[PDB]
Amino acid sequence: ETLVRPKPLLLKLLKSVGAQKDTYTMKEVLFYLGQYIMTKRLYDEKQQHIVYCSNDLLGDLFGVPSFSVKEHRKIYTMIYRNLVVVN
Ligand SMILES: [Cl-]
Ligand SMILES: [Cl-]
Ligand SMILES: [Cl-]
Ligand SMILES: [Cl-]
Ligand SMILES: [Cl-]
Ligand SMILES: [Cl-]
Ligand SMILES: [Cl-]
């Protein structure tokens, strides 16, 4: 497990979909990010590997207008900018 403390804006995003903690496992961060994308319908209905976020907090956090879920390394990099790893 990787324990992480989200920075304030990522924390706000996580709490908007029901998160309760100040530190998380990475698995939990990915869970809540997926739930956020689903509930706000940011994914492309006609190609559900694509996420559009140019008009959303997520686009500010990741620094991109859109991304493909297949870009695993890049998405991890975007998430890790928004947290600090703790032990
Ligand atoms: Cl983890
Ligand atoms: Cl922040
Ligand atoms: Cl929000
Ligand atoms: Cl939680
Ligand atoms: Cl998940
Ligand atoms: Cl990759
Ligand atoms: Cl770190």
From Swiss-Prot:
Tell me, using the record's free text, what induces this protein: By DNA damage.
Residue stretches making up the SWIB/MDM2 domain: 2-85
Region Sufficient to promote the mitochondrial pathway of apoptosis: start and end of each range?
1-77
Where does this one sit in the cell? Answer: Nucleus, Nucleoplasm; Cytoplasm; Nucleus, Nucleolus; Nucleus
The free-text tissue note of the record is: Ubiquitous. Isoform Mdm2-A, isoform Mdm2-B, isoform Mdm2-C, isoform Mdm2-D, isoform Mdm2-E, isoform Mdm2-F and isoform Mdm2-G are observed in a range of cancers but absent in normal tissues.
Ranges for the region named Necessary for interaction with USP2 are 1-86
The entry's comment on post-translational modification says:
Phosphorylated at multiple sites near the RING domain by ATM upon DNA damage; this promotes its ubiquitination and degradation, preventing p53/TP53 degradation. Autoubiquitination leads to proteasomal degradation; resulting in p53/TP53 activation it may be regulated by SFN. Also ubiquitinated by TRIM13. ATM-phosphorylated MDM2 is ubiquitinated by the SCF(FBXO31) complex in response to genotoxic stress, promoting its degradation and p53/TP53-mediated DNA damage response. Deubiquitinated by USP2 leads to its accumulation and increases deubiquitination and degradation of p53/TP53. Deubiquitinated by USP7 leading to its stabilization.
Q: Which family does it belong to?
A: Belongs to the MDM2/MDM4 family.
Q: Which disease is it linked to?
A: Seems to be amplified in certain tumors (including soft tissue sarcomas, osteosarcomas and gliomas). A higher frequency of splice variants lacking p53 binding domain sequences was found in late-stage and high-grade ovarian and bladder carcinomas. Four of the splice variants show loss of p53 binding. Lessel-Kubisch syndrome: An autosomal recessive progeroid syndrome characterized by short stature, pinched facial features, prematurely gray hair, scleroderma-like skin changes, small kidneys and consecutive kidney failure, followed by severe arterial hypertension.
The extra comment attached to this record reads: MDM2 RING finger mutations that failed to ubiquitinate p53 in vitro did not target p53 for degradation when expressed in cells.
Q: What is known of its domains?
A: Region I is sufficient for binding p53 and inhibiting its G1 arrest and apoptosis functions. It also binds p73 and E2F1. Region II contains most of a central acidic region required for interaction with ribosomal protein L5 and a putative C4-type zinc finger. The RING finger domain which coordinates two molecules of zinc interacts specifically with RNA whether or not zinc is present and mediates the heterooligomerization with MDM4. It is also essential for its ubiquitin ligase E3 activity toward p53 and itself.
Quaternary structure and partners: Interacts with p53/TP53, TP73/p73, RBL5 and RP11. Binds specifically to RNA. Can interact with RB1, E1A-associated protein EP300 and the E2F1 transcription factor. Forms a ternary complex with p53/TP53 and WWOX. Interacts with CDKN2AIP, RFWD3, USP7, PYHIN1, and RBBP6. Interacts with ARRB1 and ARRB2. Interacts with PSMA3. Found in a trimeric complex with MDM2, MDM4 and USP2. Interacts with USP2 (via N-terminus and C-terminus). Interacts with MDM4. Part of a complex with MDM2, DAXX, RASSF1 and USP7. Part of a complex with DAXX, MDM2 and USP7. Interacts directly with DAXX and USP7.
State the protein's purpose: E3 ubiquitin-protein ligase that mediates ubiquitination of p53/TP53, leading to its degradation by the proteasome. Inhibits p53/TP53- and p73/TP73-mediated cell cycle arrest and apoptosis by binding its transcriptional activation domain. Also acts as a ubiquitin ligase E3 toward itself and ARRB1. Permits the nuclear export of p53/TP53. Promotes proteasome-dependent ubiquitin-independent degradation of retinoblastoma RB1 protein. Inhibits DAXX-mediated apoptosis by inducing its ubiquitination and degradation. Component of the TRIM28/KAP1-MDM2-p53/TP53 complex involved in stabilizing p53/TP53.
The name on file for this protein is E3 ubiquitin-protein ligase Mdm2
Which source organism? Homo sapiens
**Gene name for this UniProt entry:** MDM2
